[PDB]
Nucleic acid binder design. Structure first.
Ligand SMILES: Nc1nc2c(ncn2[C@@H]2O[C@H](COP(=O)(O)OP(=O)(O)O)[C@@H](O)[C@H]2O)c(=O)[nH]1
Ligand SMILES: [Mg+2]
Lengths: 386, 122, 368
RNA sequence: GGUUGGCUUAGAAGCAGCCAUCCUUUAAAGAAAGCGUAAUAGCUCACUAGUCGAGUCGGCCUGCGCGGAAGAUGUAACGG
RNA sequence: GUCUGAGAGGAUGAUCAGCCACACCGGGACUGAGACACGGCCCGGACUCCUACGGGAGGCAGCAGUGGGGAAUAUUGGACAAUG
């Protein structure tokens, strides 16, 4: 199996050093590779979807499953990676320095994980080799537990493991080194449940092109991004218009029928009864009741600074840009909260959005904010309202 | 061997009946167009209520010539008419049916739907 | 007071602007009195609801005294009424605007601004094989004709207009009899001299020029012109080039003058793209309002006929969308943008509907 | 340092433009000779002190030179 | 026959019944008591489809139904229990 993980926390707390530590320790039994610190600290920059991110993509595997490990060399890089969702992390290794643990970077990182929808956080504290005492370590543990509880995370039942990344790289068998990274791997292999597959999720398929075939009905094309669609499956059309019922009467690709339409492939699907003008690009096909349309929602929005292309001017309440949801752009009006009138570029906060017409969304969906074709920010849905 | 002011039969389902070469494309003083060569034509006779009106100026590809096309073994391959297939503004076939045979010099990437729809590909 | 720069000056409260669609000929102009009265009804009911009956029934009588004596057969494209207490101005303009009533502090002069922005001042060079004329024109009318009593010709060193082609071959004197076939070179050098006179007059006032004549005449002129980048259009199908009136030629160049005005709007698309790529272009309505209000607006690009009502308060500079335009909002929120951009030394360009997108109807090139 | 001189201007903060050239800590520092900014910001300069140590700086006139200086049969504008 | 009209007339020819003609378009016949044959043959054609490019297949104006056209007209039902 495959799982995506990453180290979050305050700068200088040893996230990169710890990532190298797991790399080298997983290199035992050749599962990983002895990884140099500098190579991973030199994260390449990719300007994907008009957004530039420094991310170091570390990879390694265990007898349990393979891990995709994510590291960023700065707070802006971490925020961009979470919100643009280059690789959704279903598990986060909160790196806490044994001294000065709960810094504001960790403060905002935990909240960002909560908003973007990271389901599980595993706490690891490093720099224990610089700390000779025990009761301040316990105080730091209590602080991080309380902070996790403060943002809907378990906290009390959150596994906390203690060690030192420098000792792990050195090779010392002292409990704060290799043994520490070894348990940390154990919690990674046990506490983190196996993530759901795309083909195992509920069926969903955004509609990109609407056809019609004589004798067959209405054909809508698009890449199925979850579940499976088969002839005889009851499906519903959700999006711009009000939800309509239909039934699958055929799945075809290149004018040839398929046994079923699986997630990840650009299959076309036939609809029963629906007309060529009763459905349009932007709507999605979903299992009945799996998703619902909404115009008002609250999202974690990162405003691109001018350095990423971005935008010269700040966001403000009443700004109404275009919002892009997987196949379509829709005008939404930015609605800030009390005490947020000005929203500086390069920052990230939670805003409410009111779309001009409903879009099939649910918590965790990601979208781009643009005007004139220039990306001015990225976002992720954190709550939907009616 | 098609040159300017030479009439060509239309070998596709485009509505044109006869076209006249008004330019041999691909060179400053290029004289002749054989099979596979792109020419500029004016449609001289068209079918009523068709895709192409009489008097349009557009692109065509030569698909068979009366002079003939040579093969590597030295053989020549001659036809009884000079025929063309009308093309798009980006030099792509606008045909859903091809009439008569075409030669195998149309193999490539841009004249593939002309070879697949041809009744016979020599 | 019937000008743009008196209506921008006057600050009444309330200041009523009424726009009525009228027609130039009969029987189309038969519904002009009805449309005028219909607009006066909505504005009279708006004033009695917004301020009071007394203000409504003094403003309405002030405009009724003016509109009582109205022919309605000499109507232009629109009838604009600018009214207040103790003042009513009645101007007919040749532009097409949608019927609206604007009640605000200002006098809703966005269409006057848009008509002043669509104003071409050019030269008309009239070429024949026999003579040459020069007409200086402002839009549809001629400013002058460059006669021998024009006085912009006083201190000239070239031949002044009208320029007779009195070359040696035209009269038969000199040499080089017809068999040498130098007629083309004689015409080319005569048009070179005509262009010398044109350039000597242009250097003093630098307007664009339209070239009018036969195809071969204007082509010979384009061969020979010393500054061929100042030419905007050539018109070869104009008639009566020697005896014709100066106005008559100006009439025949109108299609070319409008084609040039359309080209000057297609060329603004590249300016908008340059602003967008330099991150100096604001397109949100609230963004454009803020930028224009704090003096950052360099050029405003407004789609033709784009009107929007919004709740504007400049103390906090928040332009929220209106609901019914009956709650105390500003009727023309985009006309307020146009006024602020003109106030802060900017330009407003009113872009036609087929070059500007319907969904992105406004675009402001900012100063930073 | 008063000080973003005053005015004007969307902005005019030494440096768009118009009217003065003031005072203070001074060894010295212009209500600024340039670059830069939308305006600020920022980098210089004038000026002063320090280091090194002997001549140096800029105008005027005169003579002879340099560039400005591209054509058609062949060098081809000292006859060679 | 139907509507109308006092009638004479006028208009009309859905559903029911009789007769006729047609069965993607043109032509020829075969077999048979009976056809120049709605879900048969042959040839030709237009269109649609399959193909390994050599070749092949098909005809809802039967009943459901689809796309399309339209102002507008229905179920992709059950049974041979009854009359045939
Ligand atoms: N002694 C000790 N030093 C550490 C440990 N982890 C990190 N460091 C030091 O802290 C520095 C910064 O940590 P780093 O991994 O770069 O943090 P990041 O850049 O935010 O991911 C590194 O260069 C290490 O030298 C640790 O566990 N023990
Ligand atoms: Mg790092």
């Amino acid at each position: 199996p495959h799982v995506n993980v990453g180290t979050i926390g305050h700068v200088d707390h040893g996230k990169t050093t710890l990532t190298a530590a797991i790399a080298t320790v997983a290199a035992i039994t050749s599962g990983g590779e002895a990884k140099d610190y500098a190579s991973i600290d030199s994260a390449p920059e990719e300007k994907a979807r008009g957004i530039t991110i420094n991310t170091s993509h570390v990879e390694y595997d265990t007898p349990s499953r393979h891990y995709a490990h994510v590291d960023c060399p700065g707070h802006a890089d971490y925020v961009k990676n979470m919100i643009t969702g280059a690789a959704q992390m279903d598990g986060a290794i909160l790196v806490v320095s044994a001294t000065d643990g709960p810094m504001p970077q960790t403060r905002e990182h935990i909240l960002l994980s909560r908003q973007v929808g990271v389901p599980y956080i595993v706490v690891f504290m490093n720099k224990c080799d610089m700390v000779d005492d025990e009761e301040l370590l316990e105080l730091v543990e209590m602080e991080v537990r309380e902070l996790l509880s403060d943002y809907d995370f378990p906290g009390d039942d959150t596994p906390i493991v203690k060690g030192s990344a420098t000792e792990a790289l050195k090779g010392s068998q002292e409990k704060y080194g290799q043994p520490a990274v070894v348990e940390l791997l154990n919690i990674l292999d046990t506490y983190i449940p196996e993530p759901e597959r795309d083909i195992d999720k509920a069926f969903l398929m955004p509609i990109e092109d609407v056809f019609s075939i004589s004798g067959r009905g209405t054909v809508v094309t698009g890449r199925v991004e979850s579940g499976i669609v088969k002839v005889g499956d009851e499906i519903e059309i959700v999006g711009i218009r009000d939800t309509q019922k239909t039934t699958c009467t055929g799945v075809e690709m290149f004018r040839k029928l398929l046994d079923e339409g699986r997630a990840g492939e650009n299959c076309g699907v036939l609809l029963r009864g629906t007309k060529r003008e009763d459905v349009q690009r932007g709507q999605v096909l979903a299992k009945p009741g799996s998703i619902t349309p909404h115009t008002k929602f609250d999202a974690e929005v990162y405003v691109l600074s001018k350095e990423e292309g971005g935008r010269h001017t700040p966001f403000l309440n009443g700004y109404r840009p275009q919002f892009y949801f997987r196949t379509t752009d829709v005008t939404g009006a930015i609605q800030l909260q009390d005490g947020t009138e000005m929203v500086m570029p390069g920052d990230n906060v939670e805003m409410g959005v009111e779309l001009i017409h409903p879009i099939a969304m649910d918590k965790g969906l990601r979208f781009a904010i643009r005007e004139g074709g220039r990306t001015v920010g990225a976002g992720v849905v954190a709550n939907v309202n009616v | 061997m098609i040159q300017v002011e030479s009439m060509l039969e239309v070998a596709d389902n485009s509505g044109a009946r006869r076209v006249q070469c008004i330019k041999v494309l691909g060179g400053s003083h290029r004289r002749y167009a054989s099979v596979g060569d792109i020419i500029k034509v004016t449609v001289k006779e068209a079918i009523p209520r068709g895709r192409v009106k009489k008097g349009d100026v557009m692109n065509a590809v030569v698909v068979r010539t009366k002079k003939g096309v040579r093969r590597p073994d030295g053989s020549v391959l001659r036809f009884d008419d000079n025929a063309a297939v009308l093309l798009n503004q980006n030099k792509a076939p606008i045909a859903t049916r091809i009439f008569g045979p075409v030669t195998r010099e149309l193999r490539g990437d841009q004249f593939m739907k002309i070879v697949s729809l041809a009744p016979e590909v020599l | 007071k019937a000008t743009l720069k008196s209506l921008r000056e006057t600050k009444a409260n309330p200041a009523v602007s009424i726009f009525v669609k009228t027609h130039r000929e009969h029987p189309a102009n038969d519904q002009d009195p009805i449309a005028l009265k219909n607009q006066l009804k909505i504005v009279e009911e708006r004033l009695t609801n917004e301020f009071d009956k007394r203000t409504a029934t003094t403003i309405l009588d002030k405009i009724h005294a003016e509109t009582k004596e109205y022919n309605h057969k000499y109507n232009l494209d629109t009838l604009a009424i600018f009214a207040s207490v103790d003042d009513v101005q009645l101007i007919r303009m040749p532009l097409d605007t949608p019927e609206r009533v604007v009640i605000s502090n200002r006098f809703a002069t966005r269409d006057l601004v848009r008509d002043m922005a669509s104003a071409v001042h050019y030269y008309t060079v009239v070429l024949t094989r026999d003579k040459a004329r020069l007409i200086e024109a402002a839009n549809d009318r001629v400013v002058a004709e460059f006669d021998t009593d024009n006085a912009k010709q006083n201190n000239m060193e070239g031949i002044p207009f009208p320029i007779d082609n009195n070359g040696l071959y035209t009269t038969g004197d000199g040499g080089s009899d017809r068999s040498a076939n130098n007629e083309n070179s004689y015409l080319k050098e005569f048009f070179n001299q005509v262009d010398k006179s044109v350039q000597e007059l242009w250097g003093e006032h630098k307007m664009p020029l339209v070239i009018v004549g036969d195809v071969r005449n204007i082509s010979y002129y384009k061969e020979v012109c010393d500054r061929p980048e100042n030419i905007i259009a050539t018109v070869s199908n104009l008639t009566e080039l020697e005896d014709g009136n100066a106005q008559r030629i100006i009439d025949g160049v109108q299609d070319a003058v409008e084609g040039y005005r359309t080209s000057l709007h297609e060329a603004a698309l590249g300016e908008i793209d340059k602003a967008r790529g330099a991150n100096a272009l604001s397109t949100d309505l609230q963004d454009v309002y803020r930028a224009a209000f704090q003096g950052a607006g360099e050029t405003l690009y407004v789609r033709r006929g784009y009107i929007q009502a919004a709740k504007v308060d400049e103390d906090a500079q928040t332009l929220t969308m209106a609901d019914a335009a009956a709650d105390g909002v500003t009727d023309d929120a985009v006309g307020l943008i146009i006024e602020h951009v003109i106030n802060n030394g900017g330009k407003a360009v009113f872009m036609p509907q087929e070059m500007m997108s319907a969904d992105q109807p406004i675009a402001l090139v900012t100063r930073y």
